[PDB]
Amino acid sequence: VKKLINSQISLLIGKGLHEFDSLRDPEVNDFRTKMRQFCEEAAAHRQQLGWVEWLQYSFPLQLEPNRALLVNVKFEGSEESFTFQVSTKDMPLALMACALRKKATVFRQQPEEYALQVNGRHEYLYGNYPLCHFQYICSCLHSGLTPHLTMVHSSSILAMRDEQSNLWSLEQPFSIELIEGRKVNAMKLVVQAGLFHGNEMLCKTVSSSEVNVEPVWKQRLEFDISVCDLPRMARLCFALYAVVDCPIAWANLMLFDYKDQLKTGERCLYMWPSVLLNPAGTVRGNPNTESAAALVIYLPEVAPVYFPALEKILELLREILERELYEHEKDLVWKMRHEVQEHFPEALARLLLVTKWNKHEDVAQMLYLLCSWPELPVLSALELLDFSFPDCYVGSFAIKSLRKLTDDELFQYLLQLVQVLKYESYLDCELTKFLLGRALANRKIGHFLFWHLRSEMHVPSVALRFGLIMEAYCRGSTHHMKVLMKQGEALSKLKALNDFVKVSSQKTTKPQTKEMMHMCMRQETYMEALSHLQSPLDPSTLLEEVCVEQCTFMDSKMKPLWIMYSSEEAGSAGNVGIIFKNGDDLRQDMLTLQMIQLMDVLWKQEGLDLRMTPYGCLPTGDRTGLIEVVLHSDTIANIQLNKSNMAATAAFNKDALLNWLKSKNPGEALDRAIEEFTLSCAGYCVATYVLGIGDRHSDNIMIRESGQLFHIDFGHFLGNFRVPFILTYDFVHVIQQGKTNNSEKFERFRGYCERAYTILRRHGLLFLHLFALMRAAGLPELSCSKDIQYLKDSLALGKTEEEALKHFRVKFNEALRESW
Numbered sequence: 071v072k073k074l075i076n077s078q079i080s081l082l083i084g085k086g087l088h089e090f091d092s093l094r095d096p097e098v099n100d101f102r103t104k105m106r107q108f109c110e111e112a113a114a115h116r117q118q119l120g121w122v123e124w125l126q127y128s129f130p131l132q133l134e135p136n137r138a139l140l141v142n143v144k145f146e147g148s149e150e151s152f153t154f155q156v157s158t159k160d161m162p163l164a165l166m167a168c169a170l171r172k173k174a175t176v177f178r179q180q181p182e183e184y185a186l187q188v189n190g191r192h193e194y195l196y197g198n199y200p201l202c203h204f205q206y207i208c209s210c211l212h213s214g215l216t217p218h219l220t221m222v223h224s225s226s227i228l229a230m231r232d233e234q235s236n237l238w239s240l241e242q243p244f245s246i247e248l249i250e251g252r253k254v255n256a257m258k259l260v261v262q263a264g265l266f267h268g269n270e271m272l273c274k275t276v277s278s279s280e281v282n283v284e285p286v287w288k289q290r291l292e293f294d295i296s297v298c299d300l301p302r303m304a305r306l307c308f309a310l311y312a313v314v315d316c317p318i319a320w321a322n323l324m325l326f327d328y329k330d331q332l333k334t335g336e337r338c339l340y341m342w343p344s345v346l347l348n349p350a351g352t353v354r355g356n357p358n359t360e361s362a363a364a365l366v367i368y369l370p371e372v373a374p375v376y377f378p379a380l381e382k383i384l385e386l387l388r389e390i391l392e393r394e395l396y397e398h399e400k401d402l403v404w405k406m407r408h409e410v411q412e413h414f415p416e417a418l419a420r421l422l423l424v425t426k427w428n429k430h431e432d433v434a435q436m437l438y439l440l441c442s443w444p445e446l447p448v449l450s451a452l453e454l455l456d457f458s459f460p461d462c463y464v465g466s467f468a469i470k471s472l473r474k475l476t477d478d479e480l481f482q483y484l485l486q487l488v489q490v491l492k493y494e495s496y497l498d499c500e501l502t503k504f505l506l507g508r509a510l511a512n513r514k515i516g517h518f519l520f521w522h523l524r525s526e527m528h529v530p531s532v533a534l535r536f537g538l539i540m541e542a543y544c545r546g547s548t549h550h551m552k553v554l555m556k557q558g559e560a561l562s563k564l565k566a567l568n569d570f571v572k573v574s575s576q577k578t579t580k581p582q583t584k585e586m587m588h589m590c591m592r593q594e595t596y597m598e599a600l601s602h603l604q605s606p607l608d609p610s611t612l613l614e615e616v617c618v619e620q621c622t623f624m625d626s627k628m629k630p631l632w633i634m635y636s637s638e639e640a641g642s643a644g645n646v647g648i649i650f651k652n653g654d655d656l657r658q659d660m661l662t663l664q665m666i667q668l669m670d671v672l673w674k675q676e677g678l679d680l681r682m683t684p685y686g687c688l689p690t691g692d693r694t695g696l697i698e699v700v701l702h703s704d705t706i707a708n709i710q711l712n713k714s715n716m717a718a719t720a721a722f723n724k725d726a727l728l729n730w731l732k733s734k735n736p737g738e739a740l741d742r743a744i745e746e747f748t749l750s751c752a753g754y755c756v757a758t759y760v761l762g763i764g765d766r767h768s769d770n771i772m773i774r775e776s777g778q779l780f781h782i783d784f785g786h787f788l789g790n791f792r793v794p795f796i797l798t799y800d801f802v803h804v805i806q807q808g809k810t811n812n813s814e815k816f817e818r819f820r821g822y823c824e825r826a827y828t829i830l831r832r833h834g835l836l837f838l839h840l841f842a843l844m845r846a847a848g849l850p851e852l853s854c855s856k857d858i859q860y861l862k863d864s865l866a867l868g869k870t871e872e873e874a875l876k877h878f879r880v881k882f883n884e885a886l887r888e889s890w
């Protein structure tokens with residue numbers, strides 16, 4: 071049984087557990103055991119929770135940030151359903167009471183014992199919340215569809231729970247002996263050394279003696295910093311390059327081991343290739359020992375030298391600048407450091423940036439202020455997670471402050487908290503403990519944590535860290551491990567099926583290619599693997615029976631698969647589809663869609679609903695991911711083709727979109743579609759401007775039959791080819807109800823763009839803090855300060871609300887000027 075679990079994890083994580091043992095590392099071995107225990111302890115607490123508390127794990131409530139409606143309800147062991155006229159203000163218990171009141175008349179005779187399951191979905195309806203607050207009910211009101219729910223008893227939820235069971239005395243300066251190398255290049259070679267505490271230096275960078283292109287230096291390189299002054303999170307960064315400048319390779323390492331002891335003596339560093347000094351990069355060597363260039367160094371002995379315990383550390387014009395700074399200004403903040411904790415605790419970040427980390431006595435005083443520092447708000451704590459604040463206790467302080475995070479707020483920032491793991495120095499950290507703990511406390515969190523980690527196993531620098539985390543998770547959840555295995559098996563067949571489609575497309579016609587996709591899918595192994603799975607894009611969405619006859623592929627370069635599903639239990643709710651893309655990177659798209667999804671949350675938090683389409687996007691592997699099918703939608707280009715035999719026969723190209731909406735929304739339905747279009751058009755106008763999405767043609771802009779506009783293929787963001795505001799004549803025509811002159815509908819639309827832009831500006835720091843944590847991701851279009859600077863300009867944070875709104879009106883008028 072124990073062997074089975076081991077081999078099952080290996081396949082799921084895509085890296086055999088034998089590999090972890092084959093390294094024979096104490097850090098790897100200590101992580102695996104300490105975390106297994108923590109995960110198994112968390113699995114035990116889960117097995118004793120109540121049936122309602124279990125639902126909070128297995129099926130977390132999807133909640134939104136008077137008027138009666140028709141609702142259909144049925145029981146578990148029957149087909150007979152009941153239709154009720156219940157209000158939006160009604161609690162699920164009142165609906166549960168109605169279901170038991172209409173059962174007592176049919177069966178001829180307590181709501182607290184039940185839970186309402188969503189038909190063919192891993193979503194539930196429970197708690198003291200009105201029906202209209204539920205995301206499932208809320209969607210059914212706008213679309214007009216009838217909600218289908220199932221009455222599930224406490225004993226059946228408990229049946230699910232059971233079947234799912236498992237020192238300062240060192241005044242000498244710092245030095246290293248740069249022995250030899252084992253590189254290959256074609257000139258002289260220099261080795262640059264630097265001591266770092268985050269993004270900034272501890273002492274000036276020292277270069278080596280110029281040696282010709284297997285080189286031997288054998289030189290002791292000294293640094294302008296004492297051994298006793300060296301902070302706990304001190305990083306020794308190297309850069310091997312060639313000069314007559316050409317970068318070859320880079321390599322960094324911690325001065326203290328995971329056991330806090332200062333490192334001595336000999337070390338072989340397997341260097342990572344280059345594009346000069348990179349402090350952000352990993353502290354572990356290139357696992358390609360076969361072809362990786364080595365850097366042999368010696369750490370001169372001082373004798374055990376463990377870093378001092380916290381008890382030893384603890385024993386040892388102002389307001390105007392508080393809204394990059396001069397030296398006198400930095401001294402001022404360090405001078406009145408006690409007054410900062412008392413009156414401005416939220417300014418901790420600026421105080422942590424001015425402290426001299428290269429002076430151990432300044433660090434001790436700072437840590438004493440930190441150990442009595444009151445809990446920072448989630449927002450302020452998100453800034454502390456950045457590489458700018460590397461200290462272990464500072465990292466611990468951020469986690470401690472982030473513990474107040476809701477499962478809904480954590481789901482919005484999970485991607486950033488996963489990418490921040492790349493900044494980490496040691497395997498066992500306060501972040502991983504938090505990420506694993508929250509994952510084993512909420513199944514939806516654990517689902518996305520796994521997928522964010524898995525999709526990056528192909529990246530060698532994070533393959534060891536992520537593989538170890540996923541292993542620990544599977545110890546804490548054996549059932550979910552088997553659930554995610556079904557998802558991994560489905561994605562395996564999809565890659566093979568797509569590989570055939572890519573070959574076939576270059577050899578024969580699409581009708582014959584599509585027919586041989588169906589033949590490949592209708593095979594037992596394909597049929598079984600591609601069916602009855604939780605959607606990796608959303609665990610609550612169940613992809614049951616695969617609708618092979620409706621499966622096709624897209625005509626774009628990498629031939630993306632179009633996989634449709636069907637459900638008996640759900641009906642129309644189970645008529646969901648997925649897109650399997652292979653060959654392109656879906657990381658930027660995921661990022662852009664999460665940023666757009668947040669804007670929509672922040673708009674709904676101020677009352678405004680701009681009818682945004684936050685369709686799922688998830689990279690699942692090596693240039694491989696999934697995209698959620700937006701049903702009953704089409705591109706501007708496919709709508710504007712003005713093809714014959716169709717109900718939308720337009721005379722002018724501007725009338726194409728409006729005529730399309732006329733056939734899809736008749737008479738009194740068209741009026742709703744225009745407002746749906748106008749709000750989404752306004753929503754995406756601000757979103758694309760703020761995020762800086764360029765090259766927006768008719769092929770990457772889509773419309774829903776409801777009128778709703780959305781954007782696809784986010785290939786280039788942050789104006790990385792500055793981009794202006796975009797307005798199309800075809801859209802203004804739809805907004806103005808199909809009239810050449812209608813200022814009333816245009817000014818009401820101009821009001822939506824203004825309201826949306828002003829809201830975002832207030833949360834402008836939130837977008838900055840998250841995009842800065844996303845610099846860790848290694849995205850080619852988000853790697854420097856000039857990328858982050860785009861938002862500070864597009865949102866205009868430095869200016870006031872009156873100046874920023876006026877400057878926005880300047881950009882909006884230029885978009886209408888460019889509009890023919």
Ligand SMILES: Cn1nc(-c2cnc(N)c(-c3ccc(C(N)=O)cc3)n2)nc1C1(c2ccccc2)CC1
Pocket residue numbers: 622623624625632649659685697698699700701703704705708782783784
């Ligand atoms: C009908 N219909 N619907 C959609 C569609 C729906 N929801 C989506 N989320 C996407 C999408 C999103 C992002 C990317 C990307 N990351 O680039 C790609 C696609 N597309 N597409 C088609 C069309 C189609 C043609 C042939 C076969 C199948 C379909 C007519 C174009």
